[PDB]
Design a protein around this ligand. Structure first.
Ligand SMILES: *[C@@H]1O[C@H](CO)[C@@H](O)[C@H](O)[C@H]1NC(C)=O
Lengths: 103, 101, 103
């Protein structure tokens, strides 16, 4: 089952960061609680404003972390995709003279 | 060089702060101060008010800042009642007779 | 006019983020106003310090977003540039034996 690790790693890392991205919802980020309503329930808004910032600032940052990862990770796949499209064109469709490009 | 541009006349602050009678907090008469030039340094220098408070502006920077229309709310309340009305703070005065944004 | 989309997309995305980067100047970011002087002319400094943070923290972050985008986006162009330099060398200057590399 380890031959497909390359694929298996891609699928995992995607599902990985999603889990991480989700678990970031449950973190306090310095706010009094991770449930967005509890801060609204317990506290009068004027103070709760500052609290929700630490959630937003935390979460909103936590997206840019996730987004930036995907961009970087996609740029790898984008490179790997061309490698395939190169092989598919040269190796499959033609015959390759490039030593050990096709294996 | 600095070229500050202003549009003079005179703003009747003296009538507002030295009106023999002041309206009740629940019902008050808005007064429009406009088409005039207002100096806040003279009010600060006189220091007739027991305390000078600016939630919004800074009193020293009031002269630097420009406000097209000045509106004054005149009411009489106890000193403890003045403490109740503040931005971000719930007060008995805020709850019924008057509200501050 | 759609044949040049590849170029047209590059030029747009650059001018895109710049617009976005500019429009970030007009956002409150939790501060009382987006004009850096108003916070100074409508608030004694000691408090205005904390306000300008939310501008700076917001804006300073908003650069790193823009910068990181450019880095990532340039790394794509950097990959596309080599593809050209590869074609220019192999395809134009030589004759390519690579099937469907030159089209
Ligand atoms: C109101 O009366 C006080 C005390 O006489 C005076 O200093 C002040 O200048 C008067 N009003 C204004 C703001 O002109």
């Amino acid at each position: 089952a380890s031959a497909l690790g390359k694929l298996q790693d891609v699928v995992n890392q995607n599902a990985q960061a999603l889990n991480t991205l989700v678990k970031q919802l449950s973190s306090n980020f310095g706010a009094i609680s991770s449930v967005l309503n509890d801060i609204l329930s317990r506290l009068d808004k004027v103070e709760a404003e500052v609290q929700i910032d630490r959630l937003i600032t935390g979460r909103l940052q936590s997206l840019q972390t996730y987004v930036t990862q995907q961009l970087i990770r996609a740029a790898e796949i984008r490179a790997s995709a061309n490698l395939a499209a190169t092989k598919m064109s040269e190796c499959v469709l033609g015959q390759s003279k490039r030593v050990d490009f096709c294996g | 060089e600095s070229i500050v541009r202003f549009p003079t006349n005179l703003c009747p602050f003296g009538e507002v702060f030295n009106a023999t009678r002041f309206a009740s907090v629940y019902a008050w008469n808005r007064k429009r101060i406009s088409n005039c030039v207002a100096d806040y340094s003279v009010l600060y220098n006189s220091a007739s008010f027991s305390t000078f408070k600016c939630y919004g502006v800074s009193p020293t920077k009031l002269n630097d800042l420009c406000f097209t229309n000045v509106y004054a709310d005149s009411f009489v309340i106890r000193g403890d009642e003045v403490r109740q009305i503040a931005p971000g703070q719930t007060g008995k005065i805020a709850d019924y007779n008057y509200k501050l944004p």
